[PDB]
Each structure stands twice: as C-alpha cells, then as structure tokens.
Design a protein around this ligand. Structure first.
Ligand SMILES: CC(C)C[C@H](NP(=O)(O)CNC(=O)OCc1ccccc1)C(=O)N[C@H](C(=O)O)C(C)C
Ligand SMILES: [Ca+2]
Ligand SMILES: [Ca+2]
Ligand SMILES: [Ca+2]
Ligand SMILES: [Ca+2]
Ligand SMILES: [Zn+2]
Length: 316
C-alpha cells in the first residue's frame, strides 16, 4: 500500500521483543519498505485462501499472542533478505528485488510451512508437534531459499534433484541462522519443534542419522514416499555440507573443514551457475568442485575438502 515508512515493536513466537518495519496509512501494516520492493506479511486467519489480508494493526504495537507469528515471519524475512544481499550480492529471491510475501495463521493445527510458487506460508502447528513455524529463523530462511532455488537452478522437487533442493534450503537456512548469531547450530527447526521435548529437532545436518536420515549414499531411500525421499535423502548432502564447513572423519574418511563462509560461497555459486533442474548427487559434486575451483583454485585446500566431503558420503 501507499503510505509512510514506520517502525513498530512487538514480540515473536519465543517471547523476544523486536522492532519491525511497518507502513502507516490509517492502519500500520506489516509492509517493510526498507528492503527491495518490500516485504509484506499477511493474515490467513486460520483458513487456506492465500495470501489473505495484508496485516493491519491499529497502534503499531505487536504484543498480542496472535501477533507473534506475524512479527517473526516479517522480521526473519528481513534477516534472510539481508543475508542474501550482504553476503551474496543477491537482491531478493529473483535477483531483482521481487516483493517478498508471507502468510501466517495458515489453516488449523498445521504442522508445516512452504513456498507455494509465489509466497511463503506458515502453519501455527498443533501445539504438540510444532509451535508457529515462523518462530524458527532457519525455517523462514529454508522457505525463502526454496524461492531462490526455483528462480535459479530450478531443481525438480523429487528424487535426487529434490533432495538437493531440500539440502540447499537446509544449508542456507542454517547459514542464515549463523548470520543472525542467536543460538546457532546445524540442526533444523529446533526452535519450533516439539515444545514438550528439549534438545531435539526435525533434522540434523551434523548427524542426520540421529533423526533417522541417511548420511551415506549407500543408505539412500529409493521408495515413493516424500516425493522419493526429498526430506530424507537431503541428509546425505547436508552431511557433506557440514563436513566441508566443520570437518570430521566419517566412515573413516577425514575432511578438513574450511568454514561456513566458504561453504556458503561454494554452494551459492553451484546453485546459481552450475546446477540445473535435473541435477543428481554426482552432478552436485561436480558443480561444487568446479565452484570451489573458480573461487579458490584447482590446487586449493577448498577444492580438496569438497572432494573429501563427497567421498565421505559416498557420492562420486
Ligand atoms: C523446515 C521445516 C520446518 C519445513 C519444511 N517445509 P518445506 O518447504 O520443505 C514443505 N514442502 C512442500 O510443501 O512442498 C510441496 C509443494 C507445496 C507447494 C507448491 C509446490 C510443492 C519441511 O522440512 N517440512 C517437512 C515435510 O514437508 O516433510 C515437514 C514434516 C515439517
Ligand atoms: Ca497492536
Ligand atoms: Ca538454533
Ligand atoms: Ca537450527
Ligand atoms: Ca523440541
Ligand atoms: Zn523444504
């Protein structure tokens, strides 16, 4: 909407206070004009029609329980925009400052979040499996990264290309979590998953097997559930990424870690310059090796470490 840029204040899903960029015109709207062509947050009102209504508030204060998922979707979309711009020189998900839209309060007891081709969508959870999913910065960045992938590599959402698609969202979700630097880790969704159980998460990149996912190509799922295991086989690539960054010895194969920033550079380049809609795991290895070669040189430690990591997870 047309109005003047303002700054509201509220509390997120985890009870933390934060400032949010809003727009004033009669009401204060969750419309952040400070980033690209805007970040817009909508209320789906427990229904499934999208996007719903642009979030409007009478007083620019967002401390109601109902407000919390909107505060976090809006704010974490901002952090994710900043990560892509500042770290990768990418302007929004399309590279041309496309407006970023999110809807919260989607459906009832909805234990998921997604990118629907046009916008991000967040359930509130059922209160047992999840609390409102926008409360996780890794979750918000995971979802926005699906948009980046769709605009770039275009990885088809099934089988190996789909597992790469998923891993890319977990990798950048995690790198954004480290960028914001609040309780960062290599787990996915820990801030919003199972409020009654401490110390767990939806997936682990450092040890995918902890939550039942493969950490070696020999253990890949080849059935039809989950679009051919896109959230399962992602563990193989997540493990490789973790090893590239942090190092380790995995099934007897030692990897020298090169750190998160270089992991991010290598995978961002692979995603945007080398991967295609049908890339498989072997092709991702080749894309990552070439990306590291471009950035650091063929004889670099960075290239050697990428090879070691894919060796460790059984991807040739
Ligand atoms: C980071 C997570 C908290 C959320 C994450 N959601 P996602 O974006 O991967 C769900 N994907 C999804 O709905 O794709 C289907 C689709 C939806 C709309 C248009 C095209 C394709 C996830 O891992 N979801 C899991 C799954 O869908 O298996 C669930 C179990 C949480
Ligand atoms: Ca208010
Ligand atoms: Ca964390
Ligand atoms: Ca995390
Ligand atoms: Ca938990
Ligand atoms: Zn996903």
């Amino acid at each position: 909407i047309t109005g003047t840029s303002t700054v509201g204040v509220g509390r997120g899903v985890l009870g933390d206070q934060k400032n949010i960029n809003t727009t004033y015109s009669t009401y204060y709207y969750l419309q952040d004009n400070t980033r690209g062509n805007g970040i817009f947050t909508y209320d789906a009102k427990y229904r499934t029609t999208l996007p719903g209504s642009l979030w409007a508030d009478a007083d620019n204060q967002f401390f109601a329980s109902y407000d919390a998922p909107a505060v976090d979707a809006h704010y974490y979309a901002g952090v994710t925009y900043d990560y892509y711009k500042n770290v990768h020189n990418r302007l929004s998900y399309d590279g041309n400052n496309a407006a970023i839209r999110s809807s919260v309060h989607y459906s009832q007891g909805y234990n998921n979040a997604f990118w629907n081709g046009s916008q991000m969508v967040y359930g509130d959870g059922d209160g047992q499996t999840f609390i409102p999913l926008s409360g996780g910065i890794d979750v918000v960045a995971h979802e926005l990264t699906h948009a980046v992938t769709d605009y770039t590599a275009g990885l088809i959402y099934q089988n190996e290309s789909g597992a790469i698609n998923e891993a890319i969202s977990d990798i950048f979700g995690t790198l954004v979590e480290f960028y914001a630097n609040k309780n960062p880790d290599w787990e996915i969704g820990e801030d919003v998953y199972t409020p009654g159980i401490s110390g767990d998460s939806l997936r682990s990149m450092s040890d995918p097997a902890k939550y039942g996912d493969p950490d070696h190509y020999s253990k890949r799922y080849t059935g039809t559930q989950d679009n051919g295991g896109v959230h399962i086989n992602s563990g193989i690539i997540n493990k490789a990424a973790y090893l590239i960054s942090q190092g380790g010895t995995h099934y007897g194969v030692s990897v020298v870690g090169i750190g998160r920033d270089k992991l991010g550079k290598i995978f961002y380049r692979a995603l945007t310059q080398y991967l295609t809609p049908t890339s498989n795991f072997s092709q991702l290895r080749a894309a990552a090796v070439q990306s590291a070669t471009d950035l650091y040189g063929s004889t670099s430690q960075e290239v050697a470490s990428v090879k070691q990591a894919f060796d460790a997870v059984g991807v040739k």
